[PDB]
């Protein structure tokens, strides 16, 4: 049983910030997603391009596992064809997306007494992100015609802001850990396949 190492993705002690989202390519393994789908521990498990029952029956060239942390009300933006600060400037999904978005609450692990400011997001960006694009630039945002010259100002801002993530912040401003599984189907031999249906 060469099981897919989903667990190091999901059970990583620390998770990325959304702007600097993490990606792990997964391949040459057997993937039982059905045990993952029927878990109340996941508050979101949405599949696009495929059906949750057929996931064990399908074979894919590669699987990509993107993980980050966002707040609850922003998880809606992680679907295809969504708009918002997170979808426009941090993490964008294709309209043809094939895979599953998974998310669970992480307040016990990702909250601190003053509220954890380690998790950051991109508030301003000159253009909307392409699908699966990552941008970790900390260059100063020139909204005005003023030459910013790397100086924070009235029409010049720093691009990355921070979440509160107070333990008492309430659902929808609490931290949620997201894992996006995208299924790569190329004209090449399959390497990630569902469990053998001999059962």
């Amino acid at each position, epitope marked *: 049983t060469n099981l897919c190492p989903f667990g190091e993705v999901f059970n990583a002690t620390r998770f990325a910030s959304v702007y600097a989202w993490n990606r792990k390519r997964i391949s040459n393994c057997v993937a039982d997603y059905s045990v993952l789908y029927n878990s109340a521990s996941f508050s979101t498990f949405k599949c696009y391009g495929v059906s949750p029952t057929k996931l064990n*029956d399908l*074979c894919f060239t590669n699987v990509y596992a993107d993980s980050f942390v966002i707040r609850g009300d922003e998880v809606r933006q992680i679907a295809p064809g969504q708009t918002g600060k997170i979808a426009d400037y941090n993490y964008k999904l294709p309209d043809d997306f094939t895979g599953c978005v998974i998310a669970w609450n992480s307040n016990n692990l990702d909250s601190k007494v003053g509220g954890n400011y380690n998790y950051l997001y991109r508030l301003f960006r000159k253009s909307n992100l392409k699908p699966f694009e990552r941008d970790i630039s900390t260059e100063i945002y020139q909204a005005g015609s003023t030459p910013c010259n790397g100086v924070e100002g009235f029409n010049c801002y720093f691009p990355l802001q921070s979440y509160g993530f107070q333990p008492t912040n309430g659902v929808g401003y609490q931290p949620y850990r997201v894992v996006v599984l995208s299924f790569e*189907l190329l004209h090449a*031999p*399959a390497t990630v396949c569902g469990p053998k249906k001999s059962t």
Partner: antibody
Amino acid sequence: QVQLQQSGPELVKPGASVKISCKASGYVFSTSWMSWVKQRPGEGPEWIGRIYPRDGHSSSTGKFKDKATLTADKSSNTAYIHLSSLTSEDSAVYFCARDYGYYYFDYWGQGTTLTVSS
Amino acid sequence: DIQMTQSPASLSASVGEAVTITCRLSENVYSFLAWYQQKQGKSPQLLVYRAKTLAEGVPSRFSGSGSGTQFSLKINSLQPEDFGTYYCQHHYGTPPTFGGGTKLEIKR
């Protein structure tokens, strides 16, 4: 480049067995699956099963679970299908196809015609 | 087993003409549909996979569209060598099933 040469036509008495072969070239025999398809005259094709030559695992449909067994020799890069208890309904054209795993078939054998005749 | 249904069963058209054939499925397969051409005494030959992806060596004249339960194949201008039986086949898990075909004749 990619070629799959199947064995010649076969006449077989009812109730017997037969082994049809498919010799592959132009690609890693072990990374890809080999699917087998039955076609009767006047009909569409019918998927039988596939074999993964690296670990030797085979999958088939219910109907063909007992008629057909699938084997793969990595030394000669040859995929085999063995059909047993041959009836007239079994007589058909049998194609080997290359399956990358996705269940579509980009490269096909030339077919082998199986005549089951007294 | 998903069950599949092509229309027309049969079709005649002249060179340079544009043709659309259709496939209809019991179940939502999303995008996992393939198209083949077949000729007498010969194997089927892949034309389209994943509803849109054209296979290698396949003329630009061939085009696949559709999704879910409804799919279509178009030839923008017919050529004298495009006669044959056209099969659709989902590739959405076991078992892969085919259609009953569409017989294309060239009108002349």
